[PDB]
Short mmCIF file of C-alpha atoms and ligand atoms in Angstrom, two decimals:
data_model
loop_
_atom_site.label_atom_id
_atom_site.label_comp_id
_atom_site.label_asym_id
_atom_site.label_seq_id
_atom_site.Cartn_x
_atom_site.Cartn_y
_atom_site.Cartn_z
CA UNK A 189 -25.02 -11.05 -3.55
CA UNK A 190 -23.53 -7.43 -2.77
CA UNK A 191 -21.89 -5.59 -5.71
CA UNK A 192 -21.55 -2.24 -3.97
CA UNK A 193 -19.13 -0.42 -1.89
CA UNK A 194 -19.93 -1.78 1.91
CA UNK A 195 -18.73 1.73 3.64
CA UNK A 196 -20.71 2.26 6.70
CA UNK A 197 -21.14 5.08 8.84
CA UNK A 198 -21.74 3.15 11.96
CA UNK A 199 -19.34 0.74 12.00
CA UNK A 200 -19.85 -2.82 13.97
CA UNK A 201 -18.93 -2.27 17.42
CA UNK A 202 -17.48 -3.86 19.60
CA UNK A 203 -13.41 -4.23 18.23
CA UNK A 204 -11.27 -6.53 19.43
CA UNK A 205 -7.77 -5.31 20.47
CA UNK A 206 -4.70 -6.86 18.45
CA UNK A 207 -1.80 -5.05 20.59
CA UNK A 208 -2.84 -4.92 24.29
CA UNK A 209 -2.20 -1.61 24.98
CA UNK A 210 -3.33 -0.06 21.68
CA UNK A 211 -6.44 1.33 20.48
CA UNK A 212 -8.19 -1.18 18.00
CA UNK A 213 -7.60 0.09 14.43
CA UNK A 214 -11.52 1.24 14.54
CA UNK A 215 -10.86 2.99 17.90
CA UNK A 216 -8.81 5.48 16.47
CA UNK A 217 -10.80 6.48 13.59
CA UNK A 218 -13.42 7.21 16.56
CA UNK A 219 -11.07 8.84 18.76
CA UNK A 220 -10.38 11.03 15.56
CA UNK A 221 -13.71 11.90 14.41
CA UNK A 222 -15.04 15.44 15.44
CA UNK A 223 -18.00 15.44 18.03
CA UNK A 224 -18.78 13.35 21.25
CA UNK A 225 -20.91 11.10 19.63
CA UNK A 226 -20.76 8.18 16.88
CA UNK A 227 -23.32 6.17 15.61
CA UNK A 228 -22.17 2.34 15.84
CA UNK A 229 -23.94 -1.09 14.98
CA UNK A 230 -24.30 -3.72 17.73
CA UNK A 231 -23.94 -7.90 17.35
CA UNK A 232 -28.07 -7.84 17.11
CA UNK A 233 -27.89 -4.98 14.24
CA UNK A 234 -29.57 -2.84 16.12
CA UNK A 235 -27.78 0.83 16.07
CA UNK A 236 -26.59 2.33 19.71
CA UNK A 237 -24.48 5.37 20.50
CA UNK A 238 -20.77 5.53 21.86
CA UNK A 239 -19.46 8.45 23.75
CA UNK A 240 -15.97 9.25 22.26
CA UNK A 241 -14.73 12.12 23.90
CA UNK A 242 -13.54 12.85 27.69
CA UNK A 243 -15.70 15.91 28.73
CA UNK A 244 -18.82 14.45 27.08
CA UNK A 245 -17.84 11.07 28.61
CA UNK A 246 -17.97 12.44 32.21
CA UNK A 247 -20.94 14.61 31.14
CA UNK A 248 -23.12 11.78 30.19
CA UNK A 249 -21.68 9.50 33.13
CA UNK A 250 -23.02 11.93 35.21
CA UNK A 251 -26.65 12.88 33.30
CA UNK A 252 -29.40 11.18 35.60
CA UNK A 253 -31.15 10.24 31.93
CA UNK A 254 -28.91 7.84 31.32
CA UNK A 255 -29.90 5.06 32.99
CA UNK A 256 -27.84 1.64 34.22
CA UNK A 257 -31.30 -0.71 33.80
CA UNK A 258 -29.81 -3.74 32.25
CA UNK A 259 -33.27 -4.78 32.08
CA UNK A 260 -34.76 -2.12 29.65
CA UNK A 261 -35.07 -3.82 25.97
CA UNK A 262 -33.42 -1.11 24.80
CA UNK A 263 -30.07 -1.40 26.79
CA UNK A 264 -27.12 -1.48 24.46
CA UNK A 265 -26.00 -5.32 24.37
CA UNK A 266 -22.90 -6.28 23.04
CA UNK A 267 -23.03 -9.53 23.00
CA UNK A 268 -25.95 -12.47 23.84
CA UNK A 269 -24.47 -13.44 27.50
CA UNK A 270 -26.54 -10.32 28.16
CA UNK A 271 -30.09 -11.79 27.20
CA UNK A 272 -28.72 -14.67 29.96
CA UNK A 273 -29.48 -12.63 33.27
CA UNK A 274 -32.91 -11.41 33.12
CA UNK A 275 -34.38 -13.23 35.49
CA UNK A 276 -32.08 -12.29 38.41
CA UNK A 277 -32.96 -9.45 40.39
CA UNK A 278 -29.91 -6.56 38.81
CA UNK A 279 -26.85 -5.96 41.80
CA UNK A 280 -26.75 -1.97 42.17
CA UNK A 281 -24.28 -1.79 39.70
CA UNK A 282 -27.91 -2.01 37.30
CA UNK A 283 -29.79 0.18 39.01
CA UNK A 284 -30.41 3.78 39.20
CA UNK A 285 -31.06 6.26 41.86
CA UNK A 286 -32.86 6.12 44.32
CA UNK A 287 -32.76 2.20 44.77
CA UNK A 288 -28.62 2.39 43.37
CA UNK A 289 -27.70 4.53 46.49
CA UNK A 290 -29.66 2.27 49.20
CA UNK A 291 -27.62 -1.02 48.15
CA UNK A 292 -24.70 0.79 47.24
CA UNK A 293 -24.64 2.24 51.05
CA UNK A 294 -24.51 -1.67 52.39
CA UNK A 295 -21.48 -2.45 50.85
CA UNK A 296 -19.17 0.93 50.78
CA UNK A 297 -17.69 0.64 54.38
CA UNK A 298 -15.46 -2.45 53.54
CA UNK A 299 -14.23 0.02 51.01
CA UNK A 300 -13.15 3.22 52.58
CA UNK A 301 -9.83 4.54 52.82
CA UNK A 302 -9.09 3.40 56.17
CA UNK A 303 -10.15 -0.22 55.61
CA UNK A 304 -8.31 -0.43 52.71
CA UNK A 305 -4.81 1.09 54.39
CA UNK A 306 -5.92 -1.76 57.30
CA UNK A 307 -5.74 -4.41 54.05
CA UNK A 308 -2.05 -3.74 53.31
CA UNK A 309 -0.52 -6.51 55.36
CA UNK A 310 -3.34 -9.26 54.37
CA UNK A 311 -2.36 -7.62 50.55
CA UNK A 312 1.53 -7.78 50.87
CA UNK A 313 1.09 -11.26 52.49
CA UNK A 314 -0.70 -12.58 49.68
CA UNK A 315 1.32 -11.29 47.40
CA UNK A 316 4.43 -12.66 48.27
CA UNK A 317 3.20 -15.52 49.57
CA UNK A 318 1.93 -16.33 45.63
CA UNK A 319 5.03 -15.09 44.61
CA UNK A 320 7.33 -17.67 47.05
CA UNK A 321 5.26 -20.11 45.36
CA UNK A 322 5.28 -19.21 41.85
CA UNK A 323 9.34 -19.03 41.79
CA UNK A 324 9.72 -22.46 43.83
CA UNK A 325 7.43 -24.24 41.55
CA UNK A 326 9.52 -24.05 38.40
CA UNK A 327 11.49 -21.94 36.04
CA UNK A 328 8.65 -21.01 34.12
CA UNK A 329 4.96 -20.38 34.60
CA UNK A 330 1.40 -19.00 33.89
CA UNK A 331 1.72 -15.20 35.37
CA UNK A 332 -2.08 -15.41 34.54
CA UNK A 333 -3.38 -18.80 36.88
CA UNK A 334 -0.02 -18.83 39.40
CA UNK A 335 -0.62 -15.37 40.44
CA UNK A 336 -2.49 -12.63 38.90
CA UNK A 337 -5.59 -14.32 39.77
CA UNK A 338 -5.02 -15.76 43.17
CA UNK A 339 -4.05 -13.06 44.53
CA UNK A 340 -7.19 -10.88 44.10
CA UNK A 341 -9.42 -13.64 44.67
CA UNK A 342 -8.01 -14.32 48.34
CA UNK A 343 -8.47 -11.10 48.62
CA UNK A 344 -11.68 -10.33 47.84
CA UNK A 345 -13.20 -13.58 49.34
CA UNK A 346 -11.42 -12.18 52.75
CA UNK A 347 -13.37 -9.16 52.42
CA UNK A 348 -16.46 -10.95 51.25
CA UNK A 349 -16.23 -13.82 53.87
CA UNK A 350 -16.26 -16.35 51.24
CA UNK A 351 -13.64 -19.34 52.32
CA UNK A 352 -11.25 -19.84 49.60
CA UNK A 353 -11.21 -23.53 50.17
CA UNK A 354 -13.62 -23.13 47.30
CA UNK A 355 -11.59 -21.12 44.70
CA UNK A 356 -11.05 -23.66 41.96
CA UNK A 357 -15.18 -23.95 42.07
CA UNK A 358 -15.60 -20.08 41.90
CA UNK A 359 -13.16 -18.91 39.99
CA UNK A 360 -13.97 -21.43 37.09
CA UNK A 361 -18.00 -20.20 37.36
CA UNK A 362 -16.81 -16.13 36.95
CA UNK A 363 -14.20 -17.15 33.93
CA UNK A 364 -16.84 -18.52 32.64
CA UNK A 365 -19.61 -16.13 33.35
CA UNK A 366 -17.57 -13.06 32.17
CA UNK A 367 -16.18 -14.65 29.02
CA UNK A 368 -19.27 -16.50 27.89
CA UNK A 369 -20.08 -15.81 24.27
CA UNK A 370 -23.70 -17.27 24.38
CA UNK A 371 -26.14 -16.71 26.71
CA UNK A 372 -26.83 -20.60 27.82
CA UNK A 373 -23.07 -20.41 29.32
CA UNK A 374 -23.73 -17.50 30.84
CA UNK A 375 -26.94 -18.39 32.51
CA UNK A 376 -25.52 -21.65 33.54
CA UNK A 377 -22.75 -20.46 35.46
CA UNK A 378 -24.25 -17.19 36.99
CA UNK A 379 -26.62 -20.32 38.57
CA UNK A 380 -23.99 -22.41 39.35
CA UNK A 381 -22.34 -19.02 41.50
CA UNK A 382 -25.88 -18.10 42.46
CA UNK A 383 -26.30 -21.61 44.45
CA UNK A 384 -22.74 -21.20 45.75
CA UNK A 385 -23.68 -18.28 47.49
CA UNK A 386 -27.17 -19.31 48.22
CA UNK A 387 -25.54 -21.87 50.67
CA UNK A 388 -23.45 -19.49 52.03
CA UNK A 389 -26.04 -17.23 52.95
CA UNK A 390 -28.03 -20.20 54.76
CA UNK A 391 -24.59 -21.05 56.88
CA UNK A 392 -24.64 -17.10 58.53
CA UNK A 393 -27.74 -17.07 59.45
CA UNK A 394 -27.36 -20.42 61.89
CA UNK A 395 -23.49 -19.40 61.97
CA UNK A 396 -22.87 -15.80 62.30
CA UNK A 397 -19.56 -15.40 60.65
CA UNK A 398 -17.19 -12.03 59.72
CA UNK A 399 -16.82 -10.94 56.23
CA UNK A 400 -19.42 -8.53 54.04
CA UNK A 401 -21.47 -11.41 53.17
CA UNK A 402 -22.22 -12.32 57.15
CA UNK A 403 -22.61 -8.36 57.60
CA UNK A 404 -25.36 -8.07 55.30
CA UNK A 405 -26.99 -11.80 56.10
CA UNK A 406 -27.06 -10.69 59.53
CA UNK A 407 -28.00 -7.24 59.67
CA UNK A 408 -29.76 -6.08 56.11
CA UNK A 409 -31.19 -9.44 55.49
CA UNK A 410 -32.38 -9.87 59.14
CA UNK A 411 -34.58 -6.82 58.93
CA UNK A 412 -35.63 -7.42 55.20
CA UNK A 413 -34.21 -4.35 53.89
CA UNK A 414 -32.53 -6.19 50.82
CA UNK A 415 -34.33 -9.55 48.92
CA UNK A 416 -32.10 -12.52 49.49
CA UNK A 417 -32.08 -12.90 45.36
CA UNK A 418 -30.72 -9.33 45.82
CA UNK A 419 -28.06 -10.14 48.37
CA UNK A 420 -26.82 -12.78 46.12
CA UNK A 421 -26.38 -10.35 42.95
CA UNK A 422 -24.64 -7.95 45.16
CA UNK A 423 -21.95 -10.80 46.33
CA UNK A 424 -21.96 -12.23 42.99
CA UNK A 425 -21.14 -8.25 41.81
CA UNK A 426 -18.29 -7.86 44.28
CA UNK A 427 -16.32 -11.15 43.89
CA UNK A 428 -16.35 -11.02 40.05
CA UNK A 429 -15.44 -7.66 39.89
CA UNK A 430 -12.69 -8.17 42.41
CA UNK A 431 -11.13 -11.48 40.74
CA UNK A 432 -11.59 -10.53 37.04
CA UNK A 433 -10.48 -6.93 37.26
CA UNK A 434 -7.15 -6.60 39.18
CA UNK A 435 -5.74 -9.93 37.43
CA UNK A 436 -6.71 -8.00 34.30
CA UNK A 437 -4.63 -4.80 35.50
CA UNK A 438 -1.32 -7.30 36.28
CA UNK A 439 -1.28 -9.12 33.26
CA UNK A 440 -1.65 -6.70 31.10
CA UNK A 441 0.50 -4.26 33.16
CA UNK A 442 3.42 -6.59 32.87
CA UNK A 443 3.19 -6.97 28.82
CA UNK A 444 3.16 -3.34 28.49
CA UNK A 445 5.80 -2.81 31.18
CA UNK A 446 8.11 -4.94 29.26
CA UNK A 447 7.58 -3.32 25.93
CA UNK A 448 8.53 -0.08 27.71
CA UNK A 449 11.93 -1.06 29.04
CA UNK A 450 13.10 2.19 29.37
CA UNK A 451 10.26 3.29 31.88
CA UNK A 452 9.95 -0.02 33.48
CA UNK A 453 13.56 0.66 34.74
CA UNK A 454 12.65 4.05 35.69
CA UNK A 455 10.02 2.79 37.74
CA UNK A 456 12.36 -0.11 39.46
CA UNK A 457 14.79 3.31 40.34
CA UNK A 458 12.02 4.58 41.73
CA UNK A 459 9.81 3.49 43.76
CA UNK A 460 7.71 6.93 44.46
CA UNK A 461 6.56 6.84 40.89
CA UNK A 462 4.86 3.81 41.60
CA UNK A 463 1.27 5.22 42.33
CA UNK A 464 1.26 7.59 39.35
CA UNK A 465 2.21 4.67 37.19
CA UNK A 466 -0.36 3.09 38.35
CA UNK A 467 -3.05 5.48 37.27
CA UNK A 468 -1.36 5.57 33.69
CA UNK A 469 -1.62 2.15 33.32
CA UNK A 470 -5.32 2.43 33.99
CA UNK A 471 -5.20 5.23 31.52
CA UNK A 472 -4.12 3.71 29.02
CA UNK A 473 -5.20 -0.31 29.47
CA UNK A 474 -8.62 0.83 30.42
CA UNK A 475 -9.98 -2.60 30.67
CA UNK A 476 -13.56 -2.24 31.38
CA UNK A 477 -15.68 -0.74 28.17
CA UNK A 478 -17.73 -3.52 28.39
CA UNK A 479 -19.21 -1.45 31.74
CA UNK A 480 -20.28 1.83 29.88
CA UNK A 481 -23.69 0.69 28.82
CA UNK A 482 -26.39 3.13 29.26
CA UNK A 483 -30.08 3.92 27.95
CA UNK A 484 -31.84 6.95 27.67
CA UNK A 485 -34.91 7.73 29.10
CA UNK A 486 -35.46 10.94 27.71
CA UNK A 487 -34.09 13.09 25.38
CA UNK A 488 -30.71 14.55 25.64
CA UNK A 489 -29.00 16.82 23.29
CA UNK A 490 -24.74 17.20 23.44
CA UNK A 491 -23.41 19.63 21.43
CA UNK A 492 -25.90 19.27 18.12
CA UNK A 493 -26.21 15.87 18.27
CA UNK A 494 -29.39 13.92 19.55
CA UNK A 495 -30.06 11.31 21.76
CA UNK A 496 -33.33 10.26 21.61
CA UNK A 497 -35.43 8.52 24.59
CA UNK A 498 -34.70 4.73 24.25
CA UNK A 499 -31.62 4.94 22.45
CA UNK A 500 -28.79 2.80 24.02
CA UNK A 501 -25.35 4.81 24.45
CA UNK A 502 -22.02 3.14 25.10
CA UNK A 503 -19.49 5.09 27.27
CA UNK A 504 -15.99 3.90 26.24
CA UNK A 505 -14.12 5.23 28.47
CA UNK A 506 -10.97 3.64 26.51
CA UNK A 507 -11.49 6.13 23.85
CA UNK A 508 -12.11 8.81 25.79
CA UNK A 509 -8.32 8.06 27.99
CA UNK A 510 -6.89 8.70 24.72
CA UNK A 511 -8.40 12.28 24.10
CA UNK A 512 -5.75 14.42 23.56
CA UNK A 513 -7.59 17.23 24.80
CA UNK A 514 -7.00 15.78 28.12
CA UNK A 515 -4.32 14.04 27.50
CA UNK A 516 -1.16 15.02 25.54
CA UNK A 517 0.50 12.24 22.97
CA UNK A 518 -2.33 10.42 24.76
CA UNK A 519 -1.24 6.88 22.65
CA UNK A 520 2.40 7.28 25.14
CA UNK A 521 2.57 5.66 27.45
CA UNK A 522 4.37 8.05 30.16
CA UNK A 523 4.53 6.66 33.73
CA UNK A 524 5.42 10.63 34.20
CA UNK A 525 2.62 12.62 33.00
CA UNK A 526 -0.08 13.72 34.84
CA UNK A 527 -3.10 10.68 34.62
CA UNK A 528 -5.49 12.44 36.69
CA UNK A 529 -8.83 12.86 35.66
CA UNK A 530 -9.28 9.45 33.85
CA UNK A 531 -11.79 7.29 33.26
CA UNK A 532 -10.98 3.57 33.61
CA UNK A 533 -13.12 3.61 36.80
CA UNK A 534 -16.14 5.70 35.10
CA UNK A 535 -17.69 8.46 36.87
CA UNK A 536 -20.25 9.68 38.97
CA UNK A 537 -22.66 7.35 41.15
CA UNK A 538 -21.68 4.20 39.56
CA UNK A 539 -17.78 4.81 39.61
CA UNK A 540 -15.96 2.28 40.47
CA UNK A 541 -16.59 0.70 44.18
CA UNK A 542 -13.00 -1.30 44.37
CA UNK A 543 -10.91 1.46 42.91
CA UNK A 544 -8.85 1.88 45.94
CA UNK A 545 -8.61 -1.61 47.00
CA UNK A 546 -7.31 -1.95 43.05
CA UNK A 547 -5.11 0.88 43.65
CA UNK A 548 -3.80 -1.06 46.39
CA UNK A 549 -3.11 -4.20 45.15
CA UNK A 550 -1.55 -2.87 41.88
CA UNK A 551 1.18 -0.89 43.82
CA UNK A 552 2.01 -3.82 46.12
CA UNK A 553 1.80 -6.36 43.12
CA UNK A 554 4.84 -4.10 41.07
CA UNK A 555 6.64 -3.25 43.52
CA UNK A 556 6.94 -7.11 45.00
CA UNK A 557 7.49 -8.36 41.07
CA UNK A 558 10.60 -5.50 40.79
CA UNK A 559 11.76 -6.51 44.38
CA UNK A 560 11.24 -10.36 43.93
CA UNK A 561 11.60 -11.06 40.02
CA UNK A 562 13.47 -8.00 38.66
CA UNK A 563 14.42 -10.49 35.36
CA UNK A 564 10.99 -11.43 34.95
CA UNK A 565 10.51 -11.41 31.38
CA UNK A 566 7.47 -12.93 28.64
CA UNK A 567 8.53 -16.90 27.79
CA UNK A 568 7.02 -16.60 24.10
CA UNK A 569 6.98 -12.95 21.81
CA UNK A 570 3.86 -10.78 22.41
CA UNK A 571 2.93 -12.19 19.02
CA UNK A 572 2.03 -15.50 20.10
CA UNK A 573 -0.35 -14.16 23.02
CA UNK A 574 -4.18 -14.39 22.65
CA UNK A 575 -5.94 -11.20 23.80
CA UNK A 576 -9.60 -11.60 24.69
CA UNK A 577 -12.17 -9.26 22.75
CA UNK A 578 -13.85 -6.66 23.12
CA UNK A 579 -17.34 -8.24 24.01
CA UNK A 580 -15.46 -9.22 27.84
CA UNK A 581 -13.05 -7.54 29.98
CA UNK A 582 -9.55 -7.09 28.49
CA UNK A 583 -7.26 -9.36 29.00
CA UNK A 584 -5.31 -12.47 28.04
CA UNK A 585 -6.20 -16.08 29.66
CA UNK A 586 -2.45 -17.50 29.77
CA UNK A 587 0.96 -15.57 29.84
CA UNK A 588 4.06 -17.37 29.84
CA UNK A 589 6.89 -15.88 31.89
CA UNK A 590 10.07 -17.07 32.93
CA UNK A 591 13.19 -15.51 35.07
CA UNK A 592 16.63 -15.65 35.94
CA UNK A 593 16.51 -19.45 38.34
C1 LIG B 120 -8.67 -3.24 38.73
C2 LIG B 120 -9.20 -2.36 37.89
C3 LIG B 120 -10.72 -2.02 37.83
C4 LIG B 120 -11.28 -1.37 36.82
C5 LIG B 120 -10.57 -0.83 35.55
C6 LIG B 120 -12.69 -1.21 37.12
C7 LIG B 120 -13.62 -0.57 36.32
C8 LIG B 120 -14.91 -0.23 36.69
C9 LIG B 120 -15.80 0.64 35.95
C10 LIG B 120 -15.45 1.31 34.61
C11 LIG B 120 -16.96 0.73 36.63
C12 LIG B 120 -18.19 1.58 36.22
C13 LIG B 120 -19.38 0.76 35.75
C14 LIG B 120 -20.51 1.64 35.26
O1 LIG B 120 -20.36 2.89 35.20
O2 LIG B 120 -21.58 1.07 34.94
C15 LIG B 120 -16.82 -0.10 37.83
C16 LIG B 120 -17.79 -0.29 38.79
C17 LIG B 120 -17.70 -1.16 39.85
N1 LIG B 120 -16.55 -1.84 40.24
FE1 LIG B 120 -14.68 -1.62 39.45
N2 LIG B 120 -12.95 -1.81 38.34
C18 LIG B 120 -11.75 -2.32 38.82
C19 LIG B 120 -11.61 -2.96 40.04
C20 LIG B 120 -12.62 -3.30 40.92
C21 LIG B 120 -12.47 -4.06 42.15
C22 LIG B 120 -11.12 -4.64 42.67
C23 LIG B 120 -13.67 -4.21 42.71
C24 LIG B 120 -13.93 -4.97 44.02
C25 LIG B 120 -15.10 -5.55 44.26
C26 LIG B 120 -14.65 -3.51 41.88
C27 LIG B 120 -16.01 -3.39 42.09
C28 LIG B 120 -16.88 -2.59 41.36
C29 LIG B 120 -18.28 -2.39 41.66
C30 LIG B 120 -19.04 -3.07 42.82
C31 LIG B 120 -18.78 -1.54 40.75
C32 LIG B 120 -20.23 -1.01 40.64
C33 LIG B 120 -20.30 0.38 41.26
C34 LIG B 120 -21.69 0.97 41.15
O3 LIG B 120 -22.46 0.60 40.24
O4 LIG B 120 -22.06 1.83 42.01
N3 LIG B 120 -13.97 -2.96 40.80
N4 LIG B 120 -15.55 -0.65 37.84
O1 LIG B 121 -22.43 -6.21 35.55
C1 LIG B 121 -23.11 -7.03 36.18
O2 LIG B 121 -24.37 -7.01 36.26
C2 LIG B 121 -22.38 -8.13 36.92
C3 LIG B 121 -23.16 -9.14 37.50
C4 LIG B 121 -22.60 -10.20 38.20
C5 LIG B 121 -21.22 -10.25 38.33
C6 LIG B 121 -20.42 -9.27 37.76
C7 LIG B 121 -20.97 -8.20 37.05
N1 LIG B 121 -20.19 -7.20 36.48
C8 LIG B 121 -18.82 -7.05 36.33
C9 LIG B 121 -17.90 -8.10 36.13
C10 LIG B 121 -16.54 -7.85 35.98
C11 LIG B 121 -16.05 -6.56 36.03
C12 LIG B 121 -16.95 -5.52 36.22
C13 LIG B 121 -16.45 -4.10 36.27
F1 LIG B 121 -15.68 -3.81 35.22
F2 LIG B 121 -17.44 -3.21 36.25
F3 LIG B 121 -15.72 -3.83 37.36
C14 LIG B 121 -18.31 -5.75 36.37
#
């Protein structure tokens, strides 16, 4: 057996958080460590790169040599539900220019800022009509099932045109397609959302119906301009990343709101300090490292360092939110300070589609919980929670929460 010091220099990588709103003890040492680059070992043991710094983060974001291809061997895997999906044909979200642009393009006018200002009353609706719910239903609950989910999944399946009549289906296939630890799971219930969709796709072409799904069934698909494999990736894409995401944001938002009493208040005072609170709890939740995944397909060099041609790099753009460069005191959390420039929602061609629509829904869902359930407070210490790790998107599955009857 081994006798000697077991020191690495590229530690194991992913880390799972233990506080939900602070680095992982590994994260820091990273953050801390002069250069843009570390080394770092992957599940597999096969070595990959993580970007660690904010200007080299956006820098390599943006650097057409890093490609998205999820189906390269040499893409940096965190985890085996990765190895599930090869079969599929990749959502844009995989793919790179020019092919990343030409699906991209079908699905950004749901997204722009006029549909999404048109989206506030179906938003505040929905909200509050989760909310009525939640408080009528008992004096305690599951923040997490009763209405941080919901509430982005109506949403999104309004956009999408997918009828919510099947939400307990759905919604069970993305929990477990995003938080599958093998690669069976995953492929089992990325099939069981693919057939879903499948028949949905069948129904608009006899049917004609309203929603992004119908437009792209009858107008892309109709002249053959996207695979029907493809169109089902691209929906699959959309509703995942609509549910998972935004119920992420809430949850965790409302832990870390109410270990920061003092600013919590100051936002209930006001209300105008909403948005910018907002975009510091992106900051400094940043939720989605599991999305930074790149390979390179030809040599790049950043600031001494190397990158060779086929070497995976990871973007964690959690790190990088906490460069103090950018930043200052960037492990505060100041609903006051300046959070522009972050990047929670990456950047470049691939940042984030829904970042509006998530803007949107996060300012409606904290002002209606300070308006409707100002003594909302946890039901068990932030001890007893169970954070998710690193290999998924942040998060916790249940949060108890109770209020003032
Ligand atoms: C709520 C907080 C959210 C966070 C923190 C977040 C984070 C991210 C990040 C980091 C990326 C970049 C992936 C990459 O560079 O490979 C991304 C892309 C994307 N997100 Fe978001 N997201 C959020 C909400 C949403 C919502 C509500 C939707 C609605 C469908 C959405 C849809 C997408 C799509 C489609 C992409 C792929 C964009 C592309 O490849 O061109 N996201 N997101
Ligand atoms: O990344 C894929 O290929 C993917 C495929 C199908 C469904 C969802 C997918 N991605 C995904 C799922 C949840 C959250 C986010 C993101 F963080 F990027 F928004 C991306």
């Amino acid at each position: 057996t081994a006798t000697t010091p077991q020191t690495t220099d590229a530690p194991a990588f992913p880390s799972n958080r233990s506080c939900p709103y602070q680095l992982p003890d590994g994260y820091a040492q990273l953050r801390d460590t002069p250069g843009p680059l570390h080394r770092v070992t992957l599940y597999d043991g096969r070595q990959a790169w993580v970007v660690t710094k904010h200007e080299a983060a956006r820098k390599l974001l943006g650097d057409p040599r890093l490609s998205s291809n999820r189906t390269d061997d040499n893409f940096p895997a965190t985890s085996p539900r990765f190895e599930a999906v090869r079969e599929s044909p990749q959502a844009f979200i995989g793919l790179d220019p020019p092919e990343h642009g030409t699906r991209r393009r079908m699905t950004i006018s749901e997204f722009t800022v006029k549909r999404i200002k048109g989206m506030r009353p179906e938003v505040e609706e929905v909200v509050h009509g989760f909310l009525d719910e939640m408080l009528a239903a008992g004096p305690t609950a599951d923040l997490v099932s009763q209405f941080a989910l919901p509430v982005p999944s109506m949403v999104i399946c309004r956009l999408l045109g997918v009828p919510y009549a099947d939400h307990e289906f759905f919604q069970d296939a993305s929990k477990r397609l995003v938080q599958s630890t093998d690669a069976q799971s995953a492929l089992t219930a990325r099939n069981d959302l693919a057939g879903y969709l499948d028949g949905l796709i069948t129904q608009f072409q006899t049917e004609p119906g309203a929603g992004l799904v119908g437009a792209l069934v009858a107008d892309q698909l109709a002249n053959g301009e996207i695979d029907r494999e493809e169109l089902i990736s691209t929906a699959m894409l959309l509703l995942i990343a609509g549910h998972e995401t935004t119920a992420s944001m809430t949850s965790l938002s409302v832990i870390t709101l109410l270990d920061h009493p003092e600013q919590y208040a100051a936002l209930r005072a006001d209300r105008s300090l909403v948005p910018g609170a907002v975009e510091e709890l992106l900051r400094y939740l940043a939720i989605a490292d599991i999305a930074g995944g790149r390979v390179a397909t030809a040599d790049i060099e950043v600031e001494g360092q190397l990158i060779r041609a086929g070497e995976g790099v990871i973007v964690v753009n959690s790190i990088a939110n906490r460069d103090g460069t950018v930043y200052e005191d960037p492990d505060a959390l100041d609903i006051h300070r300046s959070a522009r420039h972050h990047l929670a929602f990456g950047f470049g061609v691939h940042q984030c589609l829904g970042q509006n629509l998530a803007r949107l829904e996060l300012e409606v869902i904290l002002n209606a919980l300070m308006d409707r359930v100002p003594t909302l407070r946890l039901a068990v210490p932030v001890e007893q929670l169970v954070l998710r790790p690193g290999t998924t998107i942040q998060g916790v599955n249940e949060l108890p929460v109770t209020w003032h009857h």
